[PDB]
Amino acid sequence: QYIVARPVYSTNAFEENHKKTGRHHKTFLDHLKVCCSCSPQKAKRIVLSLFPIASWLPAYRLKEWLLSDIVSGISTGIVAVLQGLAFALLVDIPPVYGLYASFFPAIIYLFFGTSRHISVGPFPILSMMVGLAVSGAVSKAVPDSLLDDERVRVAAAASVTVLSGIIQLAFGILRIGFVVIYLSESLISGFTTAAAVHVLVSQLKFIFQLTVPSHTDPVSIFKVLYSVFSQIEKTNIADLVTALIVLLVVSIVKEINQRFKDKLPVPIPIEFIMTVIAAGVSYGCDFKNRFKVAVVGDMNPGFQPPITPDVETFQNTVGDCFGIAMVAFAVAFSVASVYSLKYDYPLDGNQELIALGLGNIVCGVFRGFAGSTALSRSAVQESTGGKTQIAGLIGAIIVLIVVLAIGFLLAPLQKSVLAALALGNLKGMLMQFAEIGRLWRKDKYDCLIWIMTFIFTIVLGLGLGLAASVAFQLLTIVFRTQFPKCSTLANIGRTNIYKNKKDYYDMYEPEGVKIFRCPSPIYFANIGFFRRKLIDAVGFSPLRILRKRNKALRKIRKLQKQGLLQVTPKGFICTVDTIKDSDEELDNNQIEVLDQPINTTDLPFHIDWNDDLPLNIEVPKISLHSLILDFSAVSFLDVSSVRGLKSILQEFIRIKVDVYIVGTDDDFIEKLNRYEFFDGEVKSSIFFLTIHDAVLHILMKKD
């Protein structure tokens, strides 16, 4: 049974009775001293962190990993070259550079990445942001045949990717890799759904084989839809039907692969065996002159010389570069986190940012585009049996083999099989659409975040949609605690349990005592509402009572000066039957005098202010004689709430009702001590430990 026999504490007698350890809080000098205190072990640890490869390469086990690693590397390399060919078209650049986006960063990641399962490269939505940023750049560059336009587009892509990599490297160096926590789960869901719809709309111009002008940021998806639906009559029926059949069978075989896992190890690489089928069917049968199907151009073999990034493209695409870098880092961290949790190894987000930045910089310098890990490719690599990043090495080797020697294949490719392959990974993100119902029935509040994120992204394009969604998500925090369900507490069962005042039957509030609870932190957006709710719950504005008391005191002093009232130690003689009620109206610049606290030290009679006054003065009465604030859920006050709380406490103290604050820990009172909260009026003895402690102290003091 709950049995306690302790003295009543008030966090002041408690501090005296129980001494503290007196821990020294960390200053600013010692922090700098300890981070700047270089040591050989610290240097070795920081170097190993900056070069994670040396951490695990000597620890590689050469018996149970090589076969699985090489198989996964081959499979992920094939899927990576196919995905690069598909994704390079989203930027309206020649597909050759796609191989670079699937080759250069991954190699760099091998020597700087900390994860062990993801497969670095391009993923479709990042490619779409690259394309949007490029279309913005070329349309804004001041001017000083189509191959020239393609070359300037690829130059813009390289520049934008180099700047994105520079931004990622700068973020990683500054050790601000904790930014990824500002993106909620609901915002991520909404962004994934909107991105799914965006990629579905953007692949249409390849499924139908039409020509669309490169649209811009303000409203992109709807413009692409309009321009692609205005020219249905100019479609290619053969390309449409082949895209539909390959997409349908790819989805079917993906469903079979997901359904059958135990009986089917090393899942069927339908992508390779089907791109080869499409290539073989196109070859010989000539789906380039018998039909008018667009075909991937002749691949020019060999690498390309690096080009310095353009300063003008840096200047014109800064905000979109910030956006693309943040999206890339967030996607990579979210993809790697699941595998890290599954296999239980440490993950360094900041090192991930550094590796991504270096990979992006290297790839962009060599005419590629921004890269990360792709969920579909990473899932393929892991499920095939990927163990370490050596699978990434084998994938890069396969991509290099394709880009160097085996390049005249994939040349008769249908240029729509790639689009269907890219869009076939849309099952998860589109099926995620069934999240409005769950959130609405669950929380009714994160559903608002999801819907607003979806609408904002769809309207604004992913460059600005993410930022607007983040702003709205941050605003929803203030929205949640904008109107706290402030309540009045009361005793239950004549014990030390206190609950809401409209929830039970055998309740008993102590006489002249009202207990208030505000179950949310009080900051700039809450102090007004908290003050209004507290005043309404109490039943009277303390300032009004104080002003009325001051006016009554002034009237009494005036009557005493006129001699109509004689001051006695007990009461007054009141040598008047009835006065004419010559109430005075105080002008401006003098009403503030009524705000001052009342001190009747001159008058021997201690006026009760609650029974009655001579000559029938107003003097409104108050039954409440003590107030306890249940600050058990208050988590932080900064400035405005502190000023409001100080004003409220001064107002209550001045009308001669004590106020007690209950439930706060030592950290809260320590923090409040800095705000100059305490002074000659609001002492430090108003803080207590538990509501029952406060009420017991009140009862002891009163009688």
Next chain:
Amino acid sequence: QYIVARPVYSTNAFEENHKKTGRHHKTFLDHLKVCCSCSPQKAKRIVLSLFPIASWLPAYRLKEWLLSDIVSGISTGIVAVLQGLAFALLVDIPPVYGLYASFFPAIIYLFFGTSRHISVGPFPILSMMVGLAVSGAVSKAVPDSLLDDERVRVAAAASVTVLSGIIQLAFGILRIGFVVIYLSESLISGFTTAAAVHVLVSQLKFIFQLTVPSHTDPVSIFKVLYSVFSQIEKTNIADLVTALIVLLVVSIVKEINQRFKDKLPVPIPIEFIMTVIAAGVSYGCDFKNRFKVAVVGDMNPGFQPPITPDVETFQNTVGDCFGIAMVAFAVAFSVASVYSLKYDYPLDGNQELIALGLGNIVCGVFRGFAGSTALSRSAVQESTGGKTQIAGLIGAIIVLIVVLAIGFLLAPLQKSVLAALALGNLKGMLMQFAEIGRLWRKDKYDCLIWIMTFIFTIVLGLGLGLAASVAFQLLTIVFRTQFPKCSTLANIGRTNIYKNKKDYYDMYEPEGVKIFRCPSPIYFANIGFFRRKLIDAVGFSPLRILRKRNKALRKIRKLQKQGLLQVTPKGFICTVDTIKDSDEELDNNQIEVLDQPINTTDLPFHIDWNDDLPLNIEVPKISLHSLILDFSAVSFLDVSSVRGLKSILQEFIRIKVDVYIVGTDDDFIEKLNRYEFFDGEVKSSIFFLTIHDAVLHILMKKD
């Protein structure tokens, strides 16, 4: 003394023992029914709210107000015409329209405003924002002698003010007048400081009588500084010296007016006598040909015909219109709130928005600009003795008299005495600069908001700086609770008081029990940090323990299948001296099997998992056998934190350690019931009332 004797409760037995009132929460149908249920009393109340004038005109007391009201009206009218002349110059439009901005809205406010002390009109910040919006509008309008430029500027000003009034009216209709609470006190202070610097820089082109191009939003103050400092040699020494002397005398007299209040009622109207002596000195002595001082042009008497607002200017300045409307409403509410608190009358924010919108619309339709209440003018009107809005009527009457009959005056005005008068009321706002020190020594977190607001406003111009600062402040809200000071609790004095684990000496944690406290709400930005801190405090990742236990069970089952181990009710025979340790490496797509909950029902021996296992299995031991989460400060969980909490609770329950949640009220458990938090695993019996209740229940269950 603190005496209590009650049974141990767990918010489930407590619910059964103490029945609830069963209050019916308001639905969506009843809310609509009650707001749509029109009633004659409700209609009368809503009409009186929509026309607050009829509320107080019959209640006017024509014995003690009329003299003070008329005096205040005359004084505020003189100061209002002077201020309008000064402020209209900030928009680079002829000063005539300034009178309109000081006349039209105020009259409208008389029939729609609810405040009783403020004086409606233009204030220099709103004029500057109008000027910036106009300069943006004319520079962006597609094209289809100097007076034509002035006429198009005034047309743009009228259009932008009409749109701002429309926005204000729309906001007031929608009853969203609570937006004004999103602006903290620190943000307000920073904005006022930056705006003081802005007005000081923008009055320079009049302080010296030069010519400056109308700069734009991106960086305005610095551009004006450069273009005004490149032409110091083209100044007017007479204008400079006269502006300096009028500034000096007005500052000195303001100082003596603040210092001397009791001995000097109805404060000296220094502005009126100063401008009249400046005009008299200019007249006759001809400060227009003896010197080259720019003067106010010949006033064209009479009103002007209304012009329809321009659609092109409407669409070109939507965002700046939103910004100016919000700034105007916030300024008016902040100015009126102080007086409402001083005189204790009801104040309606939504009605204030409606009145401001109607006034702005009427003024803009009649060729004026945006209007609000100015702190200087309102303070003058109140301190002179203003009692109600009739003083506003008298001020509007004086302005009308000036604009109709006495208009040839103020023509020999010096066009810099007005600038000096406008800038002389800046001391009380520039003295806010000494707020960085107070905040830094006080809170160290709102000082960041103040500095960021100052920098953002200075760099970006007010219209964008306000929005950027609001976004940063909303981000700071998350910043405060991004890294909660998570702590471990322990008993104090062998009683029901629990405190931090590094703050006392005679502490006693119960055996195998760790109590965790997270003193901040857990949302998307906190669940990862909370989980990491909790796991670190406990000392082991539960998932690792569960996986190792599952691996050990699989190995034991394999040995039993091979027959090397014989299962007995107590222990095993273990018919092997030592095995070769043929540890198996589980491949991918099968590791998740180790994640499944443990269930050794088939084996009769209940494995303790803490003493020892045959054949020297790893099986890490855990001393902790019960965990209590002090959810006394948790205020809200939405989705992501709920998912993380469910995962953590499942992980802990599966490794056979009970988990209890303590301190939450009925509202929190009711809310958590919706998130599908409870199921067959995490029952509803894990919630308790107090930490001592939880530990007492643990002790009772254990022994």
